[PDB]
Amino acid sequence: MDPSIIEFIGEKCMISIIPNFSNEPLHLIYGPVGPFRAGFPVFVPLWMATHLRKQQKCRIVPPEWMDMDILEEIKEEEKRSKFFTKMPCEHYMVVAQLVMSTAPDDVPRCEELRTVIKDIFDIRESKLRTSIDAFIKGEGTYAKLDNLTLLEIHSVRPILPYSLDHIARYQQRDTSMLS
Amino acid sequence: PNYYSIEDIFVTQEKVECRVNTKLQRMGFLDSDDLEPGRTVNLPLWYIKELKVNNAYFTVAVPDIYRNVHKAVCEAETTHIELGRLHPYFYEFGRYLTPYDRNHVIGRIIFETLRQRVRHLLDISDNIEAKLHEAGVRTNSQYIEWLQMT
Amino acid sequence: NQQDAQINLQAVKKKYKEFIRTFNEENFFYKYRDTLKRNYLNGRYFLEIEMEDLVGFDETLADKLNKQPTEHLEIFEEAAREVADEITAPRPEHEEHMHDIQILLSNPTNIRQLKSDCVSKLVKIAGIIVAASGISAKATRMSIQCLSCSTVIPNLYALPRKCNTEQAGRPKCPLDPFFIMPDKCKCVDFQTLKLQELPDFVPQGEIPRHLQLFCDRSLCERVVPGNRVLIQGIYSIRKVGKAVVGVRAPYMRVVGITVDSEGAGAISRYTSDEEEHFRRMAASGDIYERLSQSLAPSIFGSRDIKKAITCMLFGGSRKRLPDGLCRRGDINVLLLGDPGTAKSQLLKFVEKVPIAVYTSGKGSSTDPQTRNFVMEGGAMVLADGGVVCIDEFDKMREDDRVAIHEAMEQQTISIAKAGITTTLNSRCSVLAAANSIFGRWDDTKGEENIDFMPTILSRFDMIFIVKDIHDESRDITLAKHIINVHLSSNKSAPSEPAEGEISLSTFKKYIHYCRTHCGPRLSEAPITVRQLEVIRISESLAKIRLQPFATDEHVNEALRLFQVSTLDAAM
Amino acid sequence: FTQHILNQEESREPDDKRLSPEETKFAQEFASNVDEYFHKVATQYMPNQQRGEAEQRIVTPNLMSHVFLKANVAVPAVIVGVDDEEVDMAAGSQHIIPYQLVADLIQNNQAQLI
Amino acid sequence: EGEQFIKDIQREYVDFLDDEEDQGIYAGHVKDMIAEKSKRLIVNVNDLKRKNPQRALGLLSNAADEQLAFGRALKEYASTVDPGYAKMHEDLFVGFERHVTPRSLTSIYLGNMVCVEGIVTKVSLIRPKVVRSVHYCPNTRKVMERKYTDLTSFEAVPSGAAYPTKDEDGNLLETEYGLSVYKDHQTLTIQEMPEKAPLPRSVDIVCDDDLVDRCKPGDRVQIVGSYRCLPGKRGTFRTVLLANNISLLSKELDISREDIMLCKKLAKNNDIFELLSKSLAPSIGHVKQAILCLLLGGVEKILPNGTRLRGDINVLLGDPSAKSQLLRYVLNTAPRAIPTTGRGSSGVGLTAAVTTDQETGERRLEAGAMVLADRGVVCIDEFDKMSDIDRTAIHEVMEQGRVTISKAGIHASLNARCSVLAAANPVYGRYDQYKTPMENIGLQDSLLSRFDLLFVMLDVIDSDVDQMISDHVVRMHRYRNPKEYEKYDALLH
Amino acid sequence: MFGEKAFDLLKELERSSQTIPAFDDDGVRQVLEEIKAIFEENVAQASSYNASGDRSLWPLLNFRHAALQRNKRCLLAYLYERCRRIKALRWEFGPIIPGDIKQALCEPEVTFFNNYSKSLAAYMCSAGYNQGLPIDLTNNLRPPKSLYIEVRCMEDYGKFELDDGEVIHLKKNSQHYLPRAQVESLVRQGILHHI
DNA sequence: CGTTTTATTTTTTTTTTTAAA
Ligand SMILES: Nc1ncnc2c1ncn2[C@@H]1O[C@H](COP(=O)(O)OP(=O)(O)OP(=O)(O)O)[C@@H](O)[C@H]1O
Numbered sequence A: 001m002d003p004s005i006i007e008f009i010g011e012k013c014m015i016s017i018i019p020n021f022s023n024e025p026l027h028l029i030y031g032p033v034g035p036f037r038a039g040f041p042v043f044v045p046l047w048m049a050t051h052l053r054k055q056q057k058c059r060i061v062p063p064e065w066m067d068m069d070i071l072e073e074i075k076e077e078e079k080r081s082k083f084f085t086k087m088p089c090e091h092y093m094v095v096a097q098l099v100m101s102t103a104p105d106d107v108p109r110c111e112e113l114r115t116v117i118k119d120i121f122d123i124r125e126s127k128l129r130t131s132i133d134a135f136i137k138g139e140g141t142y143a144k145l146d147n148l149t150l151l152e153i154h155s156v157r158p159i160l161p162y163s164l165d166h167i168a169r170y171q172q173r174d175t176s177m178l179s
Numbered sequence B: 001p002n003y004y005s006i007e008d009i010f011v012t013q014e015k016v017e018c019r020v021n022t023k024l025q026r027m028g029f030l031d032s033d034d035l036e037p038g039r040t041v042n043l044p045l046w047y048i049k050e051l052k053v054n055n056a057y058f059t060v061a062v063p064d065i066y067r068n069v070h071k072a073v074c075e076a077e078t079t080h081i082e083l084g085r086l087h088p089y090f091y092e093f094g095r096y097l098t099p100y101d102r103n104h105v106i107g108r109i110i111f112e113t114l115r116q117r118v119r120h121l122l123d124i125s126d127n128i129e130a131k132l133h134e135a136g137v138r139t140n141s142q143y144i145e146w147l148q149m150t
Numbered sequence C: 001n002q003q004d005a006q007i008n009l010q011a012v013k014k015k016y017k018e019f020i021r022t023f024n025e026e027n028f029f030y031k032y033r034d035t036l037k038r039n040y041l042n043g044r045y046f047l048e049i050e051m052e053d054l055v056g057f058d059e060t061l062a063d064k065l066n067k068q069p070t071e072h073l074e075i076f077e078e079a080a081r082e083v084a085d086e087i088t089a090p091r092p093e094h095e096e097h098m099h100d101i102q103i104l105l106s107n108p109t110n111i112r113q114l115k116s117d118c119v120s121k122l123v124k125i126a127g128i129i130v131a132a133s134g135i136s137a138k139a140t141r142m143s144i145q146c147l148s149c150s151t152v153i154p155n156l157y158a159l160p161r162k163c164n165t166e167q168a169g170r171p172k173c174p175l176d177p178f179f180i181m182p183d184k185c186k187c188v189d190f191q192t193l194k195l196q197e198l199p200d201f202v203p204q205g206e207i208p209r210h211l212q213l214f215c216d217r218s219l220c221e222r223v224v225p226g227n228r229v230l231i232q233g234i235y236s237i238r239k240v241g242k243a244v245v246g247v248r249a250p251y252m253r254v255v256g257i258t259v260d261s262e263g264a265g266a267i268s269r270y271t272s273d274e275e276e277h278f279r280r281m282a283a284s285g286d287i288y289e290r291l292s293q294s295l296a297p298s299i300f301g302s303r304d305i306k307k308a309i310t311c312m313l314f315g316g317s318r319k320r321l322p323d324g325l326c327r328r329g330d331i332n333v334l335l336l337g338d339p340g341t342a343k344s345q346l347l348k349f350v351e352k353v354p355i356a357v358y359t360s361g362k363g364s365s366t367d368p369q370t371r372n373f374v375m376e377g378g379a380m381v382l383a384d385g386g387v388v389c390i391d392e393f394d395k396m397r398e399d400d401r402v403a404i405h406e407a408m409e410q411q412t413i414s415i416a417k418a419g420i421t422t423t424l425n426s427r428c429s430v431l432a433a434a435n436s437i438f439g440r441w442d443d444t445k446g447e448e449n450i451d452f453m454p455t456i457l458s459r460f461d462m463i464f465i466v467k468d469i470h471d472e473s474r475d476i477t478l479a480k481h482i483i484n485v486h487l488s489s490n491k492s493a494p495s496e497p498a499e500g501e502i503s504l505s506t507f508k509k510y511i512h513y514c515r516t517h518c519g520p521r522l523s524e525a526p527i528t529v530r531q532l533e534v535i536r537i538s539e540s541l542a543k544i545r546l547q548p549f550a551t552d553e554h555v556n557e558a559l560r561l562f563q564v565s566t567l568d569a570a571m
Numbered sequence D: 001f002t003q004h005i006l007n008q009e010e011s012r013e014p015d016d017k018r019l020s021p022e023e024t025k026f027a028q029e030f031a032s033n034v035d036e037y038f039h040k041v042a043t044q045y046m047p048n049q050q051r052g053e054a055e056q057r058i059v060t061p062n063l064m065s066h067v068f069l070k071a072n073v074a075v076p077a078v079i080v081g082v083d084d085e086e087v088d089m090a091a092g093s094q095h096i097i098p099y100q101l102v103a104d105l106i107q108n109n110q111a112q113l114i
Numbered sequence E: 001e002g003e004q005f006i007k008d009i010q011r012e013y014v015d016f017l018d019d020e021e022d023q024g025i026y027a028g029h030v031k032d033m034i035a036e037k038s039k040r041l042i043v044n045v046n047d048l049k050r051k052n053p054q055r056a057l058g059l060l061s062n063a064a065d066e067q068l069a070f071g072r073a074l075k076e077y078a079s080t081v082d083p084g085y086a087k088m089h090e091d092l093f094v095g096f097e098r099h100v101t102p103r104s105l106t107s108i109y110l111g112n113m114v115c116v117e118g119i120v121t122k123v124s125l126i127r128p129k130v131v132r133s134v135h136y137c138p139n140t141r142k143v144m145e146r147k148y149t150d151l152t153s154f155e156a157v158p159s160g161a162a163y164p165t166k167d168e169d170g171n172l173l174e175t176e177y178g179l180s181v182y183k184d185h186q187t188l189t190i191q192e193m194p195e196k197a198p199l200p201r202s203v204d205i206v207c208d209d210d211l212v213d214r215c216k217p218g219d220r221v222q223i224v225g226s227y228r229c230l231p232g233k234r235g236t237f238r239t240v241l242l243a244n245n246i247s248l249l250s251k252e253l254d255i256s257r258e259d260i261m262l263c264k265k266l267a268k269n270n271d272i273f274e275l276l277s278k279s280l281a282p283s284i285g286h287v288k289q290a291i292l293c294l295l296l297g298g299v300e301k302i303l304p305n306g307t308r309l310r311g312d313i314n315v316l317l318g319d320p321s322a323k324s325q326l327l328r329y330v331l332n333t334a335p336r337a338i339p340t341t342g343r344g345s346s347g348v349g350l351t352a353a354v355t356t357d358q359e360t361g362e363r364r365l366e367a368g369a370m371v372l373a374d375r376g377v378v379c380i381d382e383f384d385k386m387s388d389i390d391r392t393a394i395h396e397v398m399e400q401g402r403v404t405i406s407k408a409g410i411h412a413s414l415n416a417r418c419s420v421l422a423a424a425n426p427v428y429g430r431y432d433q434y435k436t437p438m439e440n441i442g443l444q445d446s447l448l449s450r451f452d453l454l455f456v457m458l459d460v461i462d463s464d465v466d467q468m469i470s471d472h473v474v475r476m477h478r479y480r481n482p483k484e485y486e487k488y489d490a491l492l493h
Numbered sequence F: 001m002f003g004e005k006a007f008d009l010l011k012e013l014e015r016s017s018q019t020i021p022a023f024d025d026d027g028v029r030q031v032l033e034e035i036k037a038i039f040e041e042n043v044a045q046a047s048s049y050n051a052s053g054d055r056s057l058w059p060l061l062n063f064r065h066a067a068l069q070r071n072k073r074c075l076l077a078y079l080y081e082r083c084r085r086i087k088a089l090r091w092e093f094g095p096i097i098p099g100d101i102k103q104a105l106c107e108p109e110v111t112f113f114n115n116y117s118k119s120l121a122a123y124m125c126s127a128g129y130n131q132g133l134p135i136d137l138t139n140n141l142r143p144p145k146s147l148y149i150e151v152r153c154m155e156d157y158g159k160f161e162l163d164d165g166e167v168i169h170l171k172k173n174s175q176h177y178l179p180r181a182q183v184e185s186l187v188r189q190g191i192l193h194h195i
Numbered sequence G: 001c002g003t004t005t006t007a008t009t010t011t012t013t014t015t016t017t018t019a020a021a
């Protein structure tokens, strides 16, 4: 439960990017990567583009859920989210941070992007105050993950469970109740 | 030896004045070798935390805020009742108390108050709630930088 | 939808809403957007904004906005609701219902500068609050049986000839069968607020002018008199015309005031390092006599006898009993003497050093609107926790000298102008100051300083007299205690360097902890009945040494201070 | 959990799977510091009957860390070991619980954690 | 008959009428055989919400219309059980039992039945208002009828107008009275209880026939009400709260025939003088035995077809400085018995010629201060200094105890059974018999039996009583304290 | 009274919060010298035939137990409470830089201290390698640069730097020809705005 | 064979009257 705990995680994901110099002073780091050639895109984890874009080395354009129309349609797809909805990579609220930090110095339209995603994040979390006004009666055996994303549940992780324990002291005897 | 507590000298030391069925012998701390059936007998808990509740020494009795007279309407008045800091151990008296008085009736009440918090702290965006309250503020205050360096 | 300019919609159509949805820079913090969320931490139903962020977008709305905000701020209302009500649920599955809102704006000006030209216009000025009314009423709509439509209103006529008890065949119903039905209504607040101009803009040869104000919903219960304001309003009207020709309406309303935080006074209405400041000095058991040169922190007097203040400001203890009485936790002390001793300015400072008022005699002391008889009250106003120190007891009318006898020995208060009985009391006290007859030559002899009663010399304690005693040794010193003390007018800062004779504000809150903990007590233990009845100062020292308890005669230190007084009434 | 973990170790001598040695050298380091500092807290007239490493001291018998479950198994209702209701499992959803009841699937690593 | 839930809402109160609470506790033989006929039942919301919580909300958002309904269900119940308590067909209002400061009625609670506590004040004029019109057609002789309404009762009004005539044809048309009934109406206002104040803001209420002035300006109460406001602001607005019950807090008694049985049995302990004398002021030697009758007022005596003799007692005595912290233990506890300022007038019993208040006024501020203690008692200080004008106005009283002044105001006579005390100061100190008793005070002996004693109060500081004074007065000062908070119980001694 | 006195201990850490000049061992002294004095209170009827084991010393036997009870666990705290903030700085440094004072050392606190410093020894043998390396965990995670340039700080204090340097004067401008081998000590105890 | 009715408050100077050590 942290700001960079996810960033120990989410940037592990890997996507096709462009390098604009070829293989480095060494040729290839062994691992899933293949070596590098300018003008030839390469898929990598995303904790190098730090050391490219801040290094003034090469560009990148994103995945396709990272665009306008698909998310300008998911904005109405989640009408079904009386449980949950479509999940484009389930971390588009963390990657977009570091993407839109330094990438959009050259990217088109980093804004409607930003607009909708904030227009999607908290609103999916309003669900998570409201659907909690459905939660009653010691429902340990009722919960919801079915298309939950990655970045949200931490924001309730520390609180209610460390409450619900010394509730759960009460959640055999005679007619009265017991804990 | 405990699910420990900050006030282990105010933890089991809040005091009640239960009456008496039978005689007494030599209280020691008090003005005492024999006293009456039925008396305002000040009783700070701990020695009677396991002192033979079934025995003919003491009776059904409550400090009456903890009696139904407040609380059994504080379950109907469970709507905007305030508690402040008053009788503090009020999520937790019964965690010991409830059967020990042996009026078999008030186990529901405290739960009935505090399970309300499943729909109190939506709008959140005693000496025990303090911890989780601090935490509730804190985690969001740092989720703030979970956005960015901000 | 006349979309050439002045359109009815653009704002709520796309624009101001989208400005809101554009107020967006990264960190994911730069928002005019989550503000109201943390307003919704309670249901505050408002929000604050600027007058120079629209300018960060454009130069076209700034001029268009400020002209007719009577329209724009409700356009903004509609944008607000129709945007924010999206937020109760992402998709249709949470809403009790929506509700109502507020929007709040933010170079100053004055009152003698704004006239016929400055009408229907928004302004920034600054003044000083005076008083204002209560919180009554106002709605937006309701309806009538006769037609049952929500009576749409332009401004916060009276249903002309159409009746609508009408379409029953013929049988008609002219001239208003309109019983207004408030059970269908809405509801708002009011205060009618007020200002006075500065003390800098020529009220001297002229008169200080002022005007009236007008508020709406949540901005009442915010402001009380004796405060200092900046504001934005409107120059608007109430009357009609063409009054030998047309004299008419001043007032303003509010939009978004911004008040002041004047420096260091207002721990009044709206740290632990300071507790470390507090306590490590009291760790030293050197406060009793150290602060006997502090209460007059910069000048001479009461020096070896100032120790007797240690009991009074902390006081004793209002130790109630099982029986009737509520004892005299309030207890009184005296001063008396001639002028020249700095006795005018010393107590002048004492108001600066908890809470009170200070002058003497007839100077505190026994409306044409909405037919209610106001009565602002008596003398416990600023003194019920506050205490006072004043001159001119006998130099005062004897009509307002019964109250003192009721006030003081008991707080035996009552009311009899109209037929109801204020049963008031207080934890208050007084000191007396003096320029009565013949001082030290009087005090040793008998009893005529006050020329009416022997009562006084009744329920008072230490008798410490102010003199200008001839002492040739001290003559030169107080001949030299007085020049540069006056001259350069310079004694401000270097009193605070002392160990514990310092820091008036820190002292204020030292004390307002010190007494303000509980009702501490004493231990087990010429000596007459009244002098005795000082027992309350037996109680004092546990706040002075900050004990729980103490015994009789270590605190008869005060008796060494009081036996000084006993020589006045020795025999 | 220096307190009663030694019960588990004297129950099972937990093998390379469960515990590790250096943890059990903390037993040395624990009793050394605690008793040889206690040697100057109360040892002048130390206890009379409960004199050793005392009876009442425990950190965490609560197996009650109420826990979120990473659904990454059989999307049909694979019903498995837990003392509360276990009906209706699936690869996304969850029936939230405490740790006391599933010491089973994560010893299998059948199930997972969020 | 709005949205047709109305009858169903009526049924839900009628559905209050089935088993042990209704069937055993509630009404029928709970009011009617105790024979009060007063429509008003006590409601207790926690029960109704335990049955029909939706209907516990049915008021709290719209209490405009629960009232014809409640009355309907009641007349159905009382009208389908008792035929005696049924020839009073009117609304027959009921209990309806959020306390906010009269300062915190803030646009809202409209439609809500909510509470505020405060002062009775400006208790005002009483005037009935009219319900129906029992109109007659004396040629055709048909007693026809026309009901009326106001917002102060419901939402609507009729064509509220002149009692009609010449309406049908011009036949014999005239009223009939004694049947066209009327409704006792009262108006007053309330203030916050002043101690909370930092101008404290008031409220305005309106009443009805069984709600009519249960106490007085100079009392205070908890009172529960709805809210409206009728006028049409800018086509200003001003409100009033209403739809009320009554309660009261500043009184004193779970005293049925048990507590009398309690008070009898301990009678026989003969020297209660001991107990009752050491009862209120153990915080004080000395008197308390003697105090007895200033509390008790006195006794009543009437001759057949003649006159009477006044009954109660008046005495006071002392060295300067126990006399101002003494006149207590009854000023607080005694029912409605008031000492006064000490040197006070404009209210002992005079008009005080000051016609700068309402521009007229004959009796407009004619009154005194002992009739508030009618069948009570009084004390004061500063008699030793007080004026001799109304000393005259005493000599009437201690002789008679009825006040009979007519300096053109009016030829008064008004009951009073009151007693009262005085002050002292020795104009020369410690002289009581060496000089003499009398006129070490600056006083008068015309008042021989006016007061009912010549008594004395004395002191000297001593050598022999020196440590006696020390050790007892401090025995007090530390039996003042606990174990002999800030102060627990002081037990021993 | 019977130990209501940790409520007094709370202010012993006041300046010693994150700006700790020095700490104090106090609040304890006769608080300890009572406890076995009142073993006499605890021993008085202890196995005495004054009553031969009957009613009137059961209820306050529990007191004798309660008195014990509150004794030991605050005595857990009295250093355990002190061992926590210790552990922060004591992860912020291995045995490089122990306490600034060691003046409020509850005299055999070294018993726990070294042992606690040596509970890490378990971890240490496994940490770094199977044989182990006292491993960098808390300090100078610069992506490290060349060894020999001087230093700037933000008024560190204690001057306890045991690392191979001539004299650094561990404050802001502890600035001498300082290699990396010296400067590997501390980061966030008043130090590192800057190099 | 139609289309309209209705409110005022504070200060003066005289002749009355009334206040304190
Ligand atoms: N026997 C006693 N019992 C109780 N209190 C006493 C006794 N003797 C003296 N005292 C205390 O001495 C004080 C004497 O001052 P006190 O307030 O009585 O002045 P006073 O008698 O009202 O003065 P004056 O009558 O001149 O106005 C009282 O407050 C009282 O509490």
Ligand SMILES: Nc1ncnc2c1ncn2[C@@H]1O[C@H](COP(=O)(O)OP(=O)(O)O)[C@@H](O)[C@H]1O
Pocket (backbone or CB within 6 Å): C299, C300, C338, C339, C340, C341, C342, C343, C344, C345, C435, C478, C481, C482, C485, C486
């Ligand atoms: N010891 C002193 N220290 C400082 N100022 C003094 C002293 N004695 C007299 N004064 C002067 O006396 C003045 C106040 O005199 P004051 O008490 O008003 O006389 P009175 O009481 O007759 O009005 C102050 O301005 C102050 O300068």
